[PDB]
């Protein structure tokens, strides 16, 4: 099998409801108290997209296929999968597309959370947010989405 | 010129019509009998995005520019282009965004088809599907889209 | 800190108005005389996404966070950031999603501009355009978007 450098991209989207004037969202392990997420899961697009980026990189079946609370269970599986396949994470770059919340205000916390759950250094993690210019389903605050991009580097 | 590791990302989108109650789509070389694709081409977002990921990685002009049935012709061009530029494929990770069909039900076939047409091992290929939460043009089954991410590794 | 190969992905979107029958857009440093961009910035999704791909790859704060004309200022920052962190650019692959303008007609100019501002060879750059099948906000010419994908390679 292929044991060289591997690229992965994870994608996720969840429906949200912003608590304006007319379950609580979790994002990179950080509770977002002014936004509700309409999902059976915790709605954490960052954690979910990171997991699928890792699975994708290794050619494993995705979380939905493998397993038809949970975000922590999936992140620990992914961490241990990387280890048992003799890989290290190089870096991860995460793009959140969302009107709200403001990722730059919670970046440090998200990066700390990701570093802890994956057992990597904060210097290996990037998380950035961009609005959708108030256009389309994301722009009208009906949903938020995440693209997670990762490199896995073979050990020795 | 640059002869080091290369990253590529391919994107494609095609209009579809799901055969519900009020040309046949091909996806990763697999016929999808309950979905029509409204395109001049075969509508195979997976094969097309894979080709453009390879061209993109190598800095070549895209399929639309190079060549203004066909999917097989383009995939063989891409395979031979990688070879003549002294590269091997590392791995490819493919993200389909679509309400239907269910990629996990046809994953094995798609992966087998990609491995055959690119002459690589199945362990170098990932294909995953995600819905769009029934929101927007993808969510309303008006279209399907694909992001293909690839690494090309120099030979010796 | 991590000093190995790094992946980055930049995303950007800007609102546009096509000058049909019932500020001027800049794209990869090329003026697009038949399209207006509705932004406080120059609206250059290519340059902006390239910058954020570089920042993302290195784990730096994004342009919006770092700096709350300008596109040239940000591209020179990114170039010098790569240098001071002891990295070289491997290659960059850029995907523009837009009905208009036609990227293939201005590809050579964009690639020349990117090579000049980043001080890299044209063989390290790919830029490709795809329509959105006249569907959604992009398809209805309300916006254009860019995904920039990059590898940074450590020096020696
Ligand atoms: N076109 C599709 C859609 C979903 N699926 C599978 O269904 C699972 C869940 O789909 P979903 O879009 O509802 O995602 P979640 O709501 O679980 O986050 C995915 O992880 C895939 O395994 C697929 O294989 N192909
Ligand atoms: N903004 C755009 C749109 C299309 N194009 C070119 O037109 C070709 C076909 O465009 P399209 O969006 O109709 O894609 P297909 O329907 O051929 O899959 C692309 O491959 C590009 O070469 C471009 O260069 N810039
Ligand atoms: N969900 C979001 C949205 C914006 N932002 C920040 O706000 C800056 C500008 O956001 P924007 O979507 O208006 O992008 P521009 O119009 O500046 O191109 C971004 O670069 C981020 O630093 C964020 O951190 N999280
Ligand atoms: Cl949801
Ligand atoms: Cl988008
Ligand atoms: Cl969207
Ligand atoms: Cl189509
Ligand atoms: Cl999307
Ligand atoms: Cl879309
Ligand atoms: Cl804008
Ligand atoms: Cl899109
Ligand atoms: Cl969009
Ligand atoms: Zn999710
Ligand atoms: Zn968009
Ligand atoms: Zn196509
Ligand atoms: Zn979306
Ligand atoms: Zn911008
Ligand atoms: Zn789309």
Numbering used by the authors:
A (entry chain A), B (entry chain A), C (entry chain A): 60 to 81, 98 to 143, 152 to 239
What do the study's own words say?
One subunit is present in the asymmetric unit of PfIspF and the trimer is generated by the symmetry operations (−x + y, -x, z) and (−y, x-y, z). PfIspF contains a 19 residue insertion at the N-terminus, Lys76 - Glu94, immediately after β1 that does not align with bacterial IspF sequences. Here, residues Tyr82 - Phe97 could not be modeled due to the lack of ordered electron density. The coordinating residues are Asp10, His12 and His44 in BcIspF, Asp71, His73 and His123 in PfIspF. The structure-based sequence alignment and overlay of the active sites of BcIspF:CMP and PfIspF:CDP complexes indicate that the key enzyme-ligand interactions and aspects of the structure that are implicated in substrate specificity and the mechanism are highly conserved. Note that in the PfIspF:CDP complex two conformers of CDP are present that differ in the orientation of the β-phosphate group. These refined satisfactorily at occupancy levels of 0.6 and 0.4. Similarly in PfIspF side chains of Tyr70, Ile72, Ile180 and Val220 line this cavity, and the side chains of Phe230 form the floor of the cavity. In PfIspF, a sulfate binds close to this site but dislodged such that anion coordination involves the main chain amides of nearby residues, Val220 from all three subunits, rather than a basic side chain. Since there are no pronounced differences between the CDP bound and unliganded PfIspF structures only the former is discussed.
2C-methyl-D-erythritol-2,4-cyclodiphosphate synthase (IspF) catalyzes the conversion of 4-diphosphocytidyl-2C-methyl-D-erythritol-2-phosphate to 2C-methyl-D-erythritol-2,4-cyclodiphosphate and cytidine monophosphate in production of isoprenoid-precursors via the methylerythritol phosphate biosynthetic pathway. IspF represents a potential target for development of broad-spectrum antimicrobial drugs since it is proven or inferred as essential in these pathogens and absent from mammals. In all IspF crystal structures three subunits form a compact bell-shaped assembly approximately 45 Å by 60 Å in the axial and equatorial dimensions respectively. The enzyme active site is located in a cleft at the interface of two subunits and here Zn2+ is coordinated by the side chains of two histidines and an aspartate.
